[PDB]
């Protein structure tokens, strides 16, 4: 199941990078640190909270329309 977390972390960092996040140095540094550390985790009980911390980054902007894109 940890593979799912690592793959979705890869996808989340991809969309974050393409949302021009890397135009702010420190935010991109923290996101890169979280993404690199999630890929190296060995238990699912730390990857999940680092994953939620990394998702809180994208849930703070206003470039991703959320209600539309969770059309289910």
């Amino acid at each position: 199941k940890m593979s799912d977390v690592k793959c979705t972390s890869v996808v989340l960092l991809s969309v974050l990078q393409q949302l021009r996040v890397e135009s702010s140095s420190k935010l991109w540094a923290q996101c890169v640190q979280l993404h690199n550390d999630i890929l190296l985790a060995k238990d699912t009980t730390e990857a999940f909270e680092k994953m939620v911390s990394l998702l809180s980054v994208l849930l703070s902007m206003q470039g991703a329309v959320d209600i539309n894109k969770l059309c289910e």
Binding site: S23, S24, S25, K26
Partner: protein, 93 residues
């Protein structure tokens, strides 16, 4: 071509090492600062000294190439700055 001719004419043969050409002739200095503590010992104040010369600060930018005033660089306000600070200055006389 005036601050470089003088130092060249003083050479015995005319040959001078390359690494001393910008040290004693260039008219702009750009220091890169990783943290506030290193900022304190090197680039403190509006004027500092380096390479046996006196330089005066004119412009400071952060990693995002946005302007930072000299009043914002404190100890407690440091965590709110992108911190490869680039400080550019002119050789004063």
């Amino acid at each position: 071509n005036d601050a470089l001719n003088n130092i060249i004419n003083n050479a015995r043969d005319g040959c001078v090492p390359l690494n001393i050409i910008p040290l004693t002739t260039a008219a702009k200095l750009m220091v890169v600062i990783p943290d506030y503590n290193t900022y304190k010992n090197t680039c403190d104040g509006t004027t500092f000294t380096y390479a046996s010369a006196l330089w005066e600060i004119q412009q400071v930018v952060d990693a995002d190439s946005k302007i930072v005033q000299l009043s914002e660089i404190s100890m407690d306000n440091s965590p709110n700055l992108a911190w490869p600070l680039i400080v550019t200055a002119l050789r004063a006389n």
